[PDB]
Amino acid sequence: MNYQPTPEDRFTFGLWTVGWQGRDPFGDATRRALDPVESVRRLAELGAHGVTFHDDDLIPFGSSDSEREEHVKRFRQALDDTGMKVPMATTNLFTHPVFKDGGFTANDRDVRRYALRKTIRNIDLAVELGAETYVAWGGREGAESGGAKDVRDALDRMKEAFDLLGEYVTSQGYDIRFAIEPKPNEPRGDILLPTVGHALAFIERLERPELYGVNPEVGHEQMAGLNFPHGIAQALWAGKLFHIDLNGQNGIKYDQDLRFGAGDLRAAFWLVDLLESAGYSGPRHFDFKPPRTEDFDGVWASAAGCMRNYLILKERAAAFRADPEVQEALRASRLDELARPTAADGLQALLDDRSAFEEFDVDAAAARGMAFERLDQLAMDHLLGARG
Amino acid sequence: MNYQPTPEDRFTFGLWTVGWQGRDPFGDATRRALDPVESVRRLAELGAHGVTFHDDDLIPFGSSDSEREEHVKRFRQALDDTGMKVPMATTNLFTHPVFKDGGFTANDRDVRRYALRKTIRNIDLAVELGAETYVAWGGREGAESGGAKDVRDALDRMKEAFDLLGEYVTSQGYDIRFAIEPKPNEPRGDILLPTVGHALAFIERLERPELYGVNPEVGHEQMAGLNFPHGIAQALWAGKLFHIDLNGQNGIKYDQDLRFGAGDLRAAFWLVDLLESAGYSGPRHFDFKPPRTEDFDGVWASAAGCMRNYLILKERAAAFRADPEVQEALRASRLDELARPTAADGLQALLDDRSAFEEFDVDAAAARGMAFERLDQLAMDHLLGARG
Amino acid sequence: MNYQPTPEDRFTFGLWTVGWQGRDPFGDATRRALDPVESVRRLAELGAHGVTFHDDDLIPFGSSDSEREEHVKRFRQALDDTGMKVPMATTNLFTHPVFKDGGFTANDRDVRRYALRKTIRNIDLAVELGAETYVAWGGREGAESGGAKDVRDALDRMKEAFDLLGEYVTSQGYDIRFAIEPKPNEPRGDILLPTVGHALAFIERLERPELYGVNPEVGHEQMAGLNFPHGIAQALWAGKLFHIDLNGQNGIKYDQDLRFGAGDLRAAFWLVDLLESAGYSGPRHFDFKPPRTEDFDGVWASAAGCMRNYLILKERAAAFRADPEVQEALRASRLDELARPTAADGLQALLDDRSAFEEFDVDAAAARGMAFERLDQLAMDHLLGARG
Amino acid sequence: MNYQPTPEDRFTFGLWTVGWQGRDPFGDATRRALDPVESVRRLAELGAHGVTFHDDDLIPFGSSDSEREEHVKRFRQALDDTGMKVPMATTNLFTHPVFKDGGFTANDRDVRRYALRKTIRNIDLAVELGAETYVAWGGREGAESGGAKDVRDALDRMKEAFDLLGEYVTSQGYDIRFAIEPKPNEPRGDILLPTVGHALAFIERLERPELYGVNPEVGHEQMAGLNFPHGIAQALWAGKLFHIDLNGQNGIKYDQDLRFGAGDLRAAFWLVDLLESAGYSGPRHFDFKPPRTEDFDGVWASAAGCMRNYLILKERAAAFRADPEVQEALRASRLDELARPTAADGLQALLDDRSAFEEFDVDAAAARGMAFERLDQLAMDHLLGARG
Ligand code: NI
Ligand code: NI
Ligand code: NI
Ligand code: NI
Ligand code: NI
Ligand code: NI
Ligand code: NI
Ligand code: NI
Incomplete structure (x- = not known):
């Protein structure tokens, strides 16, 4: 039994994952920043298929149009040098203080307009780099209190935003689809479209529903105490699993983003079984944070562990x-x-x-x-490699 | 400030609520059974508008066709005697051991067929008694382990069941609509369609989606740590709030079904504000269990408290x-x-x-x-009647 | 690798576990009752070391003094016939309606006196049968509402009860120790002494603390989202792990009591590692419920699985x-x-x-x-038997 | 009914609360830093009794011995100018990257020694400023994985640290007591001494237990789904409630630190009832974060709301x-x-x-x-001021 990944396994990682510097709400960064080029090269050596990015991971916020050009060219050369692909991209609509009440559903109308323009600019860049899926995670769309957000009006604004992005993509003739990433809470007290189910239901109310699917994350459905393989089965049943984010979570608490296989190991087994048996063909993307206890050697060990644990579980589910x-x-x-x-x-x-x-x-x-x-118990025996 | 309910407030109660004998998984009943006629009369005296029932609450399981007739006639006379209405009915597909692996999604095909016939028989009875909404709570549809239930096949079976019930209602020309009641877990380890969002998404895949909405329960969305007023706003936005179940729950734990206003009081305030301001016109139904510590005086006090707390919160939200x-x-x-x-x-x-x-x-x-x-803080002051 | 248990592995089971008939708060029993003699024999054949009981599991409530004698004699003969031991016993202070507000902390003083007499009677029986540990699970000690229970007075009553039981045991010269079993909730809204920590702190306020320890249950600490191996380490550090209840739980929800190894598998691995490396020498007791989906063949398969999964994890932790x-x-x-x-x-x-x-x-x-x-990741590889 | 606080109500606030700049794990600061002198003055105008601090809130980390002197003198003058007191102080052992694996229980022995020296230095400063209580929150003491921390050895190290601090205080003749602040998780995956119960049990194993109590925080026990008034009652019963941190939390999720009265309002009512009726005489300290949506006007409104909601609930509990x-x-x-x-x-x-x-x-x-x-329901009526 050897568990070495190859680019054919379609393992992908966000720039923000191995590049997380370890800042948490109670402490300073424990690692220096990583150059995106550095990450692409290190991930290629590990056997990864590709990388994903937020606009702001690749081009620092407020970059001049020409500094922009320069950052992209360096990145493209690293992709060319390594054979790495860029299957998905997304927008950062959560870090800058202007998004403190949301992007698409901010109460201030001028902020919602800015959020849309920032998104459209990165869709263009995503298509250029060959991405097929554009993810939206509405991390700041929500509220800490009841009166701050009329949720029917906010859902109208959310539909308006996605309908406009769909108009844009169609008008430009781009071959790219959208995937909404649910999360129930954090950093807002309650986030709109909190689970895979709410996102699937919302999509059916868009003007061109065929352009939209979901990008569920293991840890996020588990933050609501839900069964992630069940939610993925519903998404597959609906024909809407466009992408998936793999990681680990220990129960209902803050979003841990542990490496895949950590957290609820049996759920990871049933997830791999379902993905492989349903013939899911998209990227196996890891949205994870190497713990801030680690140095860079620990970062790469954690990223390798993501891939290893997928391949071990794949073997055990197939044997089962x-x-x-x-x-x-x-x-x-x-x-x-x-x-x-x-x-x-x-x-x-x-x-x-x-x-x-x-x-x-x-x-x-x-x-x-x-x-x-x-x-x-037969499934347990298979998972533990104890079949007598 | 007087907070007396009248039948015009449309408060309704299930027979199973005030009639719960207090059996829990660790103990025996603490109260004798209530005669449904007795409940109808007592609830009418309290100011309730009507009652709801499961087939098995009104006609004991295994009743002869004639014992059946007799139970219904007694019930109808109590309704006539009091002016009480029957706006909703539902099926018990969870108590009998034959439903231990589910009704509509049981692995055994003969059980799924029986489940459908048991349902259709009670739809006929519901229409006769004037119900406008027929609720389905798939309490046993789910699993304790990963391999026991292929969830895509189970969702196919679930769609098949609801599509057949919709065929039946249309073929009979009945004016009745269906409402699916989500719950995330209990009594199964994970229940299918676990939240309002998953139920709304599922409905969009039925053959005649216009016949189906949701019947969300306060405590059930809170068992997933979700914000109930937000979920109700999404259901209203979609035009699918056909009915609602009001009660209280203290957090993520077993389904408490406390009286309305107990549990998360601020969520109850924001819920009432939303219902009243959106002009929800259906029944204000209480799905609650008077605690098993209580005697019958305590049961009626708890039921009165449900209604009282709604009217106090209505007054405070309107003042706000x-x-x-x-x-x-x-x-x-x-x-x-x-x-x-x-x-x-x-x-x-x-x-x-x-x-x-x-x-x-x-x-x-x-x-x-x-x-x-x-x-x-203005909302807090209004809720507590502390406006200076 | 063969994973057959022997009585030397000290695996024990409560009569109430394999004998659970499958009654849950939403449904009827799915299995007939088991004769305690039958259970002892079947468990002996599986390789178990012994059994435990509540007074009411062995002698039906309200038995005459002579019917009592008869039930015990039958039981003792089955123990003699099989070599099975009885290392722990406990009292049922939760099923009968008289305990609806608690036993030791019931508001009614006459009920608290009855609770103590019922307990003392079974301590005598436990000693006769050779038990070394007497467990107390205060399942009904708690409240659904804030005003129903003054918790300082209830803790005074709880201390009073345990101090009296300690007086009794010492006065009788019995060699038996007490173990308090925490649970955070269910069947009461909140239960007093809700975690291992609260129970350890309470014990230090008893008059003879040396006679009391804890009996933690895997699923119960997990119902509070806590790390069970950590809690057990604190209990070992304090010298208070007198007994332990092994089972599985999937997160914060109703008390599932799944077979051991189900639920959070990595926590089970770290628990076994800790128990074996700390040299815990008491019984490995399973407090679990075979799911009500099962017939008796399924019951015995589930009980065998408890033991199997312990021995597999023991092997993997030792290899690690x-x-x-x-x-x-x-x-x-x-x-x-x-x-x-x-x-x-x-x-x-x-x-x-x-x-x-x-x-x-x-x-x-x-x-x-x-x-x-x-x-x-080395620990993961060991657990999955994937060490390359 | 007027609800104006006065310094006699003993309301206190940490410098870090109103001074939180709004950095969260997904976003940048939304407010500028506040000068501690500014905070003291603004809080005095609101009716607060005093302030609390971490060493690093008052003297920026790495300050020269003389820059130190200067920061303290400015602070003392603001205290003199306003009449504000400093009843509690604490150590920051969580922000600097050197504490990424803990302070007192870090695996590296030299870090544990540094943690103790940093603490002792601030105890001296606390006594000078008149604090009577010194709080310890072991935010980084814990683990994300099972093998990283032997919890019995970590508890030995924790006891060793607190025993040494107790030796120091006694040897110096200081009149100051220690209070341990539990939290179940965040920023570590699991934190040691996760609840009030575990902290109370641990204290009983210290060499001079009389010097140590607890500083429970409303939101932290609620992150484990526990009943905070019950936990406080146990702490009062034990004579160990030395201090308390008041705020609000909506359920089991990330630590929200909302203003007091937000979150679970009925729990806040039962807490105030208990504190007032038990005659708790320490500070009513608010450990809260004004949401990052707010500007400085919102910060002061949120701080005023903390105090207002305490006084309204006090009035309602007394009336009850x-x-x-x-x-x-x-x-x-x-x-x-x-x-x-x-x-x-x-x-x-x-x-x-x-x-x-x-x-x-x-x-x-x-x-x-x-x-x-x-x-x-009488308690509900009183809380809502609806008594007819
Ligand atoms: Ni995440
Ligand atoms: Ni993600
Ligand atoms: Ni319920
Ligand atoms: Ni309901
Ligand atoms: Ni249990
Ligand atoms: Ni147990
Ligand atoms: Ni906090
Ligand atoms: Ni605090």
Whole structure:
């Protein structure tokens, strides 16, 4: 068993992840800044497929049009030198004090207009660099108090913003799709579109829903105590999993962004099983923060660990589904029956089917055990490589 | 200030609420069963508008077709005697052991067929009694372990079930709509459609989405640590708030179903403000459990408290919105600007607007305080009746 | 690698665990009751060391003094027939409606007196059967509302109860110790002594603290989002880990009592590592509920899984600590330095040590990485059996 | 009803609270720094009694011995000019990168020695300024991963540190006591001594326990989903409430530090009731952060709101306890009986009391309702000023 990643595994990382300097709400940075070129090179050596960026990670805020040009050219050369791709980009609408009440849903109308112009400028840059997905994380869209934000008006403003971005992309003929990244809270007390479900429901109200999907993050759904593989299954069912952010989280608390596989390990196993079996073909993107206890050697070790843990879990999930004892257990728990229509015979035949009600033996049905505990222990054995 | 409810306030209660005998997972019942007729009469005396029921609350499971007839006739006479209405009904698909792996998404296909027939039978009864809304709470739809439930297949089965019920209602020409009640967990480890957002997104995939809305419950969204007024605002924005369940919950733990106003009192204030200001016109339904510490006098006191606390909060929220100091504060925090379109001028004019980017003074914008803390203290003063 | 338990592994189970009939707050029992004799025999065949009981699990509430005698004799014969031991016993002070406001801290004084007499009667029975530890879980001690319970008076009543039980045991010359089992909530809204920490602090205020320790349960500390291995380390540090309850829990929600190893698997690994390395010598007791989806075959599979997962994790934790690469990593992260006194030289020498402050190079110290991410990935590799 | 604070209400604020510049983990500061002298003056005008500080709030880290002298003299003059007191001080052992793995429990021994010297230096300064309480918040004491911290060794190091500080204070003859401030997590993944209970238990293992108490913070116990008034009652029962930090928190999430009265309003009511009725005489200290949405006018409004909400709740709790209808309800719920000993007659008389068991009517006892819901609605009415 060797678990070395290759660019064909499509592992990607944000510039902001390995480049996080370790500033947290109670302390100063513990690491120096990383040159984006440096990160691209180090990640390529680790076996990564590509990188992602916020506008402000690549071009420092307030850069002159020409300093801009210069930063991009250096970056493009590093991409050329290494074979690294840029599959996704996003906008920083949360760090600058002007976004303290939000970007697209700020109460001040002039700030909402600025937020849109800042976004459109980076969409152009993303397309140039070849990105196929443009992510939006509305980190400042929300409130700490009840009267500060009329949420129906804010949702109108949010729809207005995304509809305009969709108009722009279509008018320019760009081949790029949008992905909304939910988070329930932090840094705002409550953030709008707090879960995968709220984001999926919102998308259905946009003018061109086909251009929008979700970019769920493992830790964010877990901050609401939700089951991440279930949420991803709903997103896949809807045809809306455009991208995904992988990391780890230990429960309901502040957003930890631990390396993937840390946090809830069994959820990571069921997630990998689902992604691989559904044939998800997008990037396996890591949105994580190497802990501020680490020096740069620790940063690269943490990034390598993300990829390693994905490949180990992939191997264990494949072994699980391939095991004939597990296929027998699946039939014993009637997963095969779950996949069959309830009533392909139609409503009238169901209504006339006396075996469905009048003469249904409910006591016999109730006595049938589901055998889920044996199945789950087979999954545990596979995960731990303890199959005897 | 007098806070007496009248049937015009549209307060409703489930039979199962005041009739809960106090059985919990660690203990026996502490109260005798209540005769549904008794409950209808006592609730009418308290000023309630009507009652709701599960099929099994009104007709004990396994009743003969004629015992059935008899239970309904007694109930109808109590409704006639008191003027009480029956605006909503629902199905019990969770108590009987045959539903231990779910009703609509049970792995066993014969159980899913039985679940549909049990539901259809009660829809007929609901229409007869005049209900306008039929609620579905999929309490057993979910799993304790990862391999027990393929969630895409389960969502296919769930869609299949709701599509069939919609076919039935339309074919019968019934004027009744469906409302899905989300809950994140309990009694299953994770329940499918765990929040208002997931339910709204699911509805958009049904064949006739116009027949389906949500029935959110205060405590259930709070079990995921979510902001209930925000979720209700999203549901109103979508035109899908068909019904609502009011109660109290203290945080992320087991489903407490405390009387309304208990639990998170400020959230109750912002909820009432939103409902009243959005002109929600459905029932104000209480889905609550009088604590098992109480005798029947305590049960009626708890039910009266539900209604009282709604009317006090209604008065305080109205006073808040009517106060000219608060209207000035709202303008100071630019709630008026939030309600104005960001770019009614259109995309091209936004792109050509140099005041939106090239010459936007971001530092000046960032320095503007939002004045949210003064506004929130005005709301606190109003809530506590301390306005000086 | 074979993972078969033997009675020498000291695995124990409560009668109430495999015997749980599957009644939950939303549904009826799905399994018939188990005869305690049946359970003892089945558990012995699985490799268990012994069983535990509540008074009411073994002798149905309200039994005549002679029916009592009969139930105990049958039980003792099953113990004799199988070699099974009874290391712990406890009292049911939560199921009967008379305990709806608590046992030791009920507001009614006559109920508190009854609670003490019911307890003392079972202590006598526990000693007869050879138990060394008597557990107290104050499941009903607490409140749903603020005014219902003066908590200082309730703590006085709680101390009074435990002091009296300690007087009784000493006066009778019994060799038995007490263990308090914390839980933060459920079935009460908030339960008194909600965590391992509150229980340890309370014990220090009893008249004979040496007779009392804690019986922490994995899932219960996790219901407060706490780190269970940390809490156990504090209990070991204090010399108060008298017993332990092993199971699994997925986060902050209702008390799931899943089989051990389910729920937070990495926490289970760090717990086993700590128990084995601290040389904890008491029973490895499982307080778990086989899910109500299961028939009796599923019940025994779930119980076997508890033991299996302990032995797999024991093997992986031992391999981790024995690996020379891990010992090197531990030194690299300065775990050796953590175990050395900070200032064995004493206060004055610390005050006079200029290398401790005046001439301490804080920048050099701050630049040293802790190398925790490499260490944690070594632990992950060991846990998953992926060491290359 | 007028709710103006005076210095006699003993309201205090940390320099770091109104002086928080609004830097959060996702964004830059939104406010300029405040001169400590400026804060003292503004707080005095608001009616505050005094201020508290971390060493680094008052003297910027790395200050020369003489720059030090200068900062203190300016501060002392502002205190003299306004009549403001300094009742508590504390050490910053969390911001500087050298504390990234902790201060007292850092794995590096030289960092632990530095942490102690930095603390001792500020204790001297605290005594000079008249502080009576010295707080310790071990924000960096903890871990993100299982192997990084042996918690028994860390607790040995923690005890060693506090024992040395107690030696120092006694040797110097200072009249100052220590208060440990628990927090469950953030900025570390898990923090040692995570709740009031763990801190109380730890204190009992110090060499001179009488010198140490707790400084609980409303939001911190709520981050573990615990009931703060209950925890404070346990701390009062133990004689260990040396100080308290007041603020608001909405549930289990990141540490919000909202103004007092925000967050869980009913918990704030029950807390004030308990503090006032137990005659707590220390400072009413606010550890809060004015939201980063605010300008300086908003900062002062938020600080004023802290004090206002305390005085409103004080008035409502006093009215509640003074109301004869409430005293009757308290007797009806048998709070009077809770305060009476269970068995002042002693163990033998309890054992011989047949009314306690043999002839106890359990059914009659069980039928008695506790009347807690009526009592809680009286408390609600009082809180909302709706008593009819
Ligand atoms: Ni995150
Ligand atoms: Ni992300
Ligand atoms: Ni509920
Ligand atoms: Ni409900
Ligand atoms: Ni439990
Ligand atoms: Ni237990
Ligand atoms: Ni805090
Ligand atoms: Ni604090």
